[PDB]
Amino acid sequence: QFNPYGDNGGTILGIAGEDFAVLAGDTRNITDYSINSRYEPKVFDCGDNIVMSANGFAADGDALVKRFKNSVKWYHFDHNDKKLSINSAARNIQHLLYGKRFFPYYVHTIIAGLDEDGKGAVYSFDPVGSYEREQCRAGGAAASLIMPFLDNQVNFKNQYEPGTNGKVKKPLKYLSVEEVIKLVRDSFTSATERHIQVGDGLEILIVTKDGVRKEFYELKRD
Amino acid sequence: TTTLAFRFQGGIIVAVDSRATAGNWVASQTVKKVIEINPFLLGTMAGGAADCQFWETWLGSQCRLHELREKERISVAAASKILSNLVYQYKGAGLSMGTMICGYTRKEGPTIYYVDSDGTRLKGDIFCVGSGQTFAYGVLDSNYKWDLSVEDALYLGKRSILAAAHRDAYSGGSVNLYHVTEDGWIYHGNHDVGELFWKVKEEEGSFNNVIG
Amino acid sequence: NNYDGDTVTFSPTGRLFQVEYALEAIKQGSVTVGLRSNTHAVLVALKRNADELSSYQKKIIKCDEHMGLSLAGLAPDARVLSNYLRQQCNYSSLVFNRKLAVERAGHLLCDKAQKNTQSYGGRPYGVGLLIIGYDKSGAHLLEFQPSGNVTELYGTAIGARSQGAKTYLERTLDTFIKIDGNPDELIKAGVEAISQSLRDESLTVDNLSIAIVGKDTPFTIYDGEAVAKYI
Amino acid sequence: TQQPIVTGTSVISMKYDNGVIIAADNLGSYGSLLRFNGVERLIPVGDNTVVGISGDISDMQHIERLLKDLVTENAYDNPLADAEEALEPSYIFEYLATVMYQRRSKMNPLWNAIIVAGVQSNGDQFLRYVNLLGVTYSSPTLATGFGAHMANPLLRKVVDRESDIPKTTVQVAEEAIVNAMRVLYYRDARSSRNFSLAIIDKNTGLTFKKNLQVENMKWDFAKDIKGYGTQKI
Amino acid sequence: DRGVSTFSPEGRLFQVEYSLEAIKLGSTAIGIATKEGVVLGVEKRATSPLLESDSIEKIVEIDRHIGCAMSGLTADARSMIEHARTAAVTHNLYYDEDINVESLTQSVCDLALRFGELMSRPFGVALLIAGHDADDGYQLFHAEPSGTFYRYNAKAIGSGSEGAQAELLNEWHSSLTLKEAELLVLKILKQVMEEKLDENNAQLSCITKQDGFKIYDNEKTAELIKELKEKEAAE
Amino acid sequence: SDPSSINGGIVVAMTGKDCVAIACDLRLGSQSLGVSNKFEKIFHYGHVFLGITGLATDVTTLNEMFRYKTNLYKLKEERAIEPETFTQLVSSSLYERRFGPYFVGPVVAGINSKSGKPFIAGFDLIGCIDEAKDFIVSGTASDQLFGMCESLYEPNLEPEDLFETISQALLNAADRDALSGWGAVVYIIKKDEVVKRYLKMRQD
Amino acid sequence: GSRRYDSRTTIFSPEGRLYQVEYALESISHAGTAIGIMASDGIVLAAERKVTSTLLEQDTSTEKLYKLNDKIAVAVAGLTADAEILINTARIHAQNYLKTYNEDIPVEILVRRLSDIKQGYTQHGGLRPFGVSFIYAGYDDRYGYQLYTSNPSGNYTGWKAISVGANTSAAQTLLQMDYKDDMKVDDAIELALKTLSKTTDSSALTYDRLEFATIRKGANDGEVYQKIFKPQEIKDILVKTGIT
Amino acid sequence: GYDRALSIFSPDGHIFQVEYALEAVKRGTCAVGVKGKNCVVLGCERRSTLKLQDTRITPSKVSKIDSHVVLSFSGLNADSRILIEKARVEAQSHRLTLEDPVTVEYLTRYVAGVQQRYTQSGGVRPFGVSTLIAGFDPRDDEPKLYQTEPSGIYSSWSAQTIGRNSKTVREFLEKNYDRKEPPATVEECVKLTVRSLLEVVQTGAKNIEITVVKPDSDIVALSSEEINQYVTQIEQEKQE
Amino acid sequence: MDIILGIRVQDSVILASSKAVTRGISVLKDSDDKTRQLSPHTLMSFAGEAGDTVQFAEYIQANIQLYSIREDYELSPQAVSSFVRQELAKSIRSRRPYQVNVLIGGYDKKKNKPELYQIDYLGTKVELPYGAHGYSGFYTFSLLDHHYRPDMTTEEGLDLLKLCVQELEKRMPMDFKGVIVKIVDKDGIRQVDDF
Ligand SMILES: N=C1N[C@H]2n3c(c(Br)c4ccccc43)C(=O)N3CCC[C@]23N1
Ligand SMILES: [Mg+2]
Ligand SMILES: [Mg+2]
Ligand SMILES: [Mg+2]
Secondary structure (H helix, E strand, C coil), rough: CCCCCCCCCEEEEEEEEEEEEEEEECEEEEEECCEECCCCCEEEEECCCEEEEEEEEHHHHHHHHHHHHHHHHHHHHHHHCCCCCHHHHHHHHHHHHHHCCCCCCEEEEEEEEEEECCCEEEEEECCCCCCCECCCCECCCCCHHHHHHHHCCCCCCEEEEECCCCCCCCECCCCCCCHHHHHHHHHHHHHHHHCCCCCCEEEEEEEEECCCEEEEEEEECC | CCEEEECCCCCCEECCCEEECCCCCEECCCCCEEEECCEEEEEEECCCCHHHHHHHHHHHHHHHHHEEEEEECHHHHHHHHHHHHHHHCCCCCCCEEEEEEEEEECCCCCEEEEEEECCCEEEEEEEEEEECHCCCCCCCCCCCCCCCCHHHHHHHHHHHHHHHHHHHHCCCCCCEEEEEHHHHHHHEEEHHHHHHHHHHHHHHHHCCCCCC | CCCCCCCCCCCCCCCCCHHHHHCCCCCCCCCCEEEEECCCCEEEEEECCCCECEEEECEEEECCCCEEEEEEHHHHHHHHHHHHHHHHHHHHHCCCHCCHHHHHHHHHHHHHHHHHHHHCCCCCEEEEEEEEEEEEEEEEEEEEECCEEEEEEEEEECCCCCCHEEEEEHHHHHHHCCCCHHHHHHHHHHHHHHHHCCCCCCCCCCCCEEEEEEECCCEECCCHHHHHHCC | CCCEEEEEECCEEECCCCCCEEECCCCCCECEEEEECCCEEEECCCCCCCEEEEEEEEHHHHHHHHHHHHHHHHHHCCCCCCCCCCCCCHHHHHHHHHHHHHHCCCCCCCCCCEEEEEEECCCCCEEEEECCCCEEECCECCCCCEHHHHHHHHHHCCCCCCHHCCCCHHHHHHHHHHHHHHHHHHCCCCCCCCCEEEEECCEEEEEEHHHHHHHCCCCCCHHCCCCCCCCCC | CCCCCCCCHHHHHHHHHHHHHHCCCCEEEEEEECCCCCCEEEEECCCCCCCCCHCCCCCEEEEEEEEEEEEHHHHHHHHHHHHHHHHHHHHHHHHHCCCCHHHHHHHHHHCCCCCCCCCCCCCEEEEEEEEEECCCCCEEEEECCCEEEEEEEEEEEEEHHHHHHHHHHCCCCCCCCCCHHHHHHHHHHHHHHHCCCCCEEEEEEECCCCEEEECCCCHHHHHHHHHHHHHHCCC | CHHHHCCCCEEEEEEECCCEEEECCEEEEECEEEEEEECCCEEEEEEEEEEEEECHHHHHHHHHHHHHHHHHHHHCCCCCCCCCHHHHHHHHHHHHHCCCCCCEEEEEEEEEECCCCCCEHHHCCCCECCCCEEEEEEEEHHHHHHHHHHHHHCCCCHHHHHHHHHHHHHHHHHCCCCCCCCEEEEEEECCCCCEEEECCCCCC | CCHHHHHCCECCCCCCCCCHHHHHHHHHHHCCCEEEEEEEEEEEEEECCCCCCCCCCCCCCCEEEECCCCCCCEEEEEEEHHHHHHHHHHHHHHHHHHHCCCCCCCCCHHHHHHHHHHHHHHEEECCCCCCCEEEEEEEEEEEEEEEEEEECCCCEECEEEEEEEHHHHHHHHHHHHCCCCCCCHHHHHHHHHHHHHHHCCCCCCCCHHHHEEEEEEEECCCCEEEEEHHHHHHHHHHCCCCCC | CCCCCCCCECCCCCCCCHHHHHHHHCCCCEEEECCCCCCCCEEECCCCCCCCCCCCCCCCCCCCCCEEEEEEEEEEEEEEHHHHHHHHHHHHHHHHCCCCCCCHHHHHHHHHHHHHHHHCCCCCCCEEEEEEECCCCCCCCCCEEEEEEECCEEEEEEEECCCCCHHHCCCCCCHCCCCCCCCCCHHHHHHHHHHHHHCCCCCCCCEEEEEEECCCCCEECCCHHHHHHHHHHHHHHHHH | CCEEEEEEEECCEEEEECCCCEEEEEEEECCCCCEEEEECEEEEEEEEEECHHHHHHHHHHHHHHHHHHHHHCCHHHHHHHHHHHHHHHHHCCCCCCEEEEEEEEEEECCCCCEEEEEEECCCCCCECEEECCHHHHHHHHHHHHHCCCCCCCCCHHHHHHHHHHHHHHCCCCCCCEEEEEEEEEECCEEEEECC
């Protein structure tokens, strides 16, 4: 019997800062126990200061990104070159996903950018289109390894101020872009150690008011 | 998942938890399980997250079209029936929905309809849906009165979700409260279950089984 | 006369009057100019207002990053044909990862217009189009007629009083074709060309509409104070 | 939904400094029966692209006809069909990838794994993969089926990352490809000795080699191997 | 007879040109755009005194940020309004935002030339579409059965249009207040109407960023009519 | 689960000298539960009689369908349909639902008004005609009916003797079937008189 | 194209009349007269066949009176072929109703249905209307004995006595003169035949030029019987009433 | 399918097929509607050119669309049945989906929409019918009276008439109907409705039909004798 | 849903229907009315698959109300039951059948007789002096077979109905939360508010 789905592995991570946002992902592509590519880009600049990644089954992932990029193009044609805001992009992606409710895109989608007040924004989707704005979200193979670490080191969960013994929480102070990138790199380094599908390379797309910048880092290739 | 809604003297209380799971894995603790259909109507999320989100936003669009055409606020009866008739068309295809459509109009007063993906549409005073529904029902049934104050009713809904969050493994995170009046719903905050549990334990004297 | 009731009827001399009447709608339209060098291609269009309270009707439509057109005649027909071009450009990019050649875009517009001239019930399109673009064989300018006839040119003009601009371009042919790597001078030549078609009115800041595409220049439209530099 | 009947095994390929190399054997298997011994599975498109196909042979012949029709169609009303508006490797791949994903989405796939190898107009090397699921990826080396498990490890020792490509000559690359084909003949039960090899170079163009054979084989050591444990004679 | 989609020798569609004549017979509608809002006004024109005039609905809401006034065969407008309302709501569903006034207008105008031998004839009604969005501010559009739409600072349609448009030519400037626009619509409506203008045979409306689209009460308009009378008697 | 034995019931038909007889039980049930003791399974359109066993909803539907069709037949033909012709109509009507059939076992009985010849016929659920000279059986106790009829039947029985034979065939067959019984009706049919008799039987 | 040859069968005149309906009514005015009379104990249907021949097989012939079901019959005036199309549709509708509700179709519901079919041909489709007028004679347990007529416009009305076809003006005046509410079937039989005898364009009214039918509760007890008269039976009733 | 555009514009901007449909309405028997303080009355003309009619079974001029709304008309009788059927189906569809009966305005808006659709759809002609739609909204005691016409325009009326000689009876209503004080009782409203028809009808015998609709689904048709008593009292006051 | 009972006495038809609505684990409601008035003298109770029950009942109600308005006439109970049977017989060979069983209690004003019809989801119709759907008949029919008389008063019918409900409450495993009882007679439909 023909199975229309597959699993290309990969892990992605989106974090929203005060006036910035990052969307990162490893560059390894796999089937079963084989490596297809050590460098296959997974996070894409979609225009209008929006970055996107659809992790899971790569064929569905490529199809969705391609259709969203197309939706941005037609949004410009139909509405006098108006900039597609991140909230509007998120609602649009819901309809793209729910359109195939009974034959779903087998992916976990994350988009990142800035909202209309210039504040950092990350949105997270399930395969059939349910979505939410979030501060922090890992997706894919090693998501279960990364999220607890982020709960602890970004949101300071289970951390209290010394001397008070559980009475006063550690205050939620804002993180810089340099600080966030450190946590992203350590997240993927740790995931590379303990998850076989994670490795080769890490590509990070950073979004600010100035535009979209890229950073690349080597990961272990075993 | 635990969601509830009940009618009382001062309108409707809606209370939900915030947890979403994929198997044993806790996907999110910050899920918005009350869908703001419009400033006067609320819907609750249980079963399929997308099915509830998508079709209740769609419901908001239909309600907006109704009041543009008829120059009058849509009834809770009519709004709930638009949704139930829609999901009935899809029956068999695999939609998953268990929701309370909540509103307060002039002609009806405070009204709640339980709508469900196999086509069920039930009017009622108290409804509770989700994996932790049985726990919340216990607190509701033993403490509910029509003549509850808005303050006490809000607490009752909060306390009932807490009961479910404690015992049901797939319920937790935080509690979202809403109070539905004739002039529209009012949001009454996000309440972390971790902090709420200890606060309630001390002030109420409950949960003596748990060491704090 | 007796042969102009529909598009499915030849006259005794072999003419199609409904098509000729559709051609007449273009002549009533406002003037628009097209010209190109070897590096860039330019559209210049005189926009028309209803009155002093009204806006000036837009004339130029973007089809892709590397292609777009200007219209003269029935504006809704231009919207239909430009939408079709947008789709075809888009099909080429999505399916073949290939930017649609300007010549092939002209062939597609010809065939779409032709079907409306040989069938009962329908009507010809009532608009003329000037398509500019930059593809793998450089800069291009096309002229579309709703008869179906599409022609590749160095320069041209359509609309009311377009003959004046067309004669100017025919004189200047050897000069403006050589304007390579200088967008401003090529637009100047186009603004000077469209000026040969003006009477009573002159080019103002909300009157003028300019578009350009080239080697390292995406199709962009200039309106308002962005064209004051060229007035 | 179907099942593959007559099938072709591995297709292997890699990039080198001035272009790409691709190879595949000439067998059409019918289950374990080695039925057809003269099957060409590398199909050139113009003088800049070679498409290598594994999996179902009936579907391969269909794809072959699609590519033939693509060349005919591109030439229509196209004065620059043999120049600026010729078919690029990237155009040919994207078309195939579209078809493959559409067919899997109708639950009626073309049961193949495909590698498109070529050189672009600007001299850039093109090498990308697509299969029955519509899954696509690129890498300095690419291989299908058994080749993925056995050829890639050998080819990756020559070009391990992007920066190794300019350091790799056509002689070194071809040598590596030919050795990989020998290894596959040793170890793949659905492979043959006869194969085809194609080189697409930005300077010397398309070189298509037919009727190549696996040679320099080691078998002599077999004479000393006796029994399965304790047997001496 | 002859095709419904036939061109004349001058290059105009017969049916479109004829529908424009039907619009000339319609009751007057006026729109004025300012930096404080857009005002829409109409002549009700009841055929008899026994007709309850508040049931005459020639000004209509499309969305909270978009209103619309009509002139001509007003029955034809109902499906156009339905499409406009659906388009406005649908876009909000797809994009979680308000739709641009121009985009809404363009969507309505796409229906216009969908006739032949689709509907059997063009619409016999013209629309003034007024609204506000964040990108282009307060806007007024004139949607015709030809499929063409022009943006206007001020515009009049219907039987008293050319006399009203000449008056709007002189009176409009870029610094008009909302109050000044209200009186100006009332003044020009009073000029071109057959019957004497009052709160029962004329109707006002406006669209502001803060309050959205609002049809004025008869009591509210009656005060503005009294204010108009006094300021005209003031010189 | 098996649609032909959810409701239960039986029909039997026999030929005699210048006469035919058709009989049926009165039970309708939901498997083990007895629901009705007044569910008659024999219908008539003019002088042509039709018994139907099987799924009760289809029994009712087909009666309504053949009443529909024989009424139109009569209006157009200006005469009552004959047993031979009606038999072909039943066959045609059943086969048109070849791949979504009515779960029934119809039985036709009657005398041709012109020739005076007695006629009976049977069908499977899909339209195959069984035109026996002697007898036709149908229903959940068809095996029992075949046994009774084969031994009790003899040709050229007079109307009042045929009544006894067919009655005893039905009664004793029904008493060996859980899903049949709860009353019984016998039609004795001659060229221009038909007598209907309800039989007394055990009610378990 | 094809527009050139379109007669446009469904348009108003400047006066607000439907051309084709009016012209179809003109056609019907040349058809043989049909009369219906309703009494307290039954209904009579009488109709004149159009200029016949001696070689026409009368006993197997039917051009005027048709059975729709056991309770309802119709008299036809106009194109016979058109009438049979509608008659078959009406027969089917009656059976559809009987299957659905397990009750005989009420007379008016059948009449409304056929009349709506006629109406459709005047408003859409671009086809010519049916050149037929019906007189419906029927019985149901709600209103009892009922007479209706319908014409190509699709309009229908109820009657105590009515005529369609040729010389309706003269026929209706004669019926209006002699009809009374307490009238019985045997009296109505006489009135119908006397009216046809005076209005006919033929020299004399004979059995071979007539079709006759009665709907009576003269059926043994609480039921209704339709009687389509045979040629010999029409000959006898002509002698009984003193016309021949 | 037959697609011919029958309703089209003429050079002077008129749609003649719609205008000729109004001429069919002009030919139809007169219909009148009058709303009192707590009721609405619908009066209808019956042409006495047709006697020997069976009045028990003949289609009545006023039709119930629901238990609380009625519809009368002037124009083609066969055309009106199609509109009445559609209106009745929509009324039940509304109850089924909204769980509330139609408002009088909604039902009017639907019927008017159907009429409009038949003026720009291919292969169809407009309805030769104008309607008067009257009743009370659910749980409301305010009287409602609306009018529709072939073009599809509709509006609310304190009192209105349609059909032949409607110009005359509208003349009567315009001078006799006071808005500040409408007919306070059922008697006064029926009297004014009968009076308005007597300007046009001929004999006050079986030529006048009267239907009274009150709040909460209270609809009754007056008999010959009841109407005859109004006819008698009106002329006895007139002899002065 | 669960238990629906019917009994036809001398001058009326009595329908009894359970109040419970259970969604798997919990009883969501204990006051549910499993009936729809089709016409002034005709009542229909129902039980079957969730959603389909109310959808079917309201669909039938709408159709009978439409007929009543069109003809200004109330259909007989027999005619209504035949319409309902055909709809279910049509439904059973559909893509997704209505899984709904019904009882139709009506008073025929023409014949001055009460009438009770039992129809299952297949379109199996029978006219009965008393009837039920599901397992309800298994517990109650032996009592009805014993005590039932055709000349019973309405009060005697209610008493026999109480005995049936008591037996159900004793031997049935499920708690159906009592029954709503409605009477259909010459004066129309009324609910017994204390049972
Ligand atoms: N962070 C979220 N993403 C969605 N989401 C949800 C689940 Br469970 C899940 C599992 C894998 C990937 C995404 C997922 C899920 O339940 N969600 C509800 C709101 C949207 C979502 N939350
Ligand atoms: Mg690792
Ligand atoms: Mg037995
Ligand atoms: Mg037993």
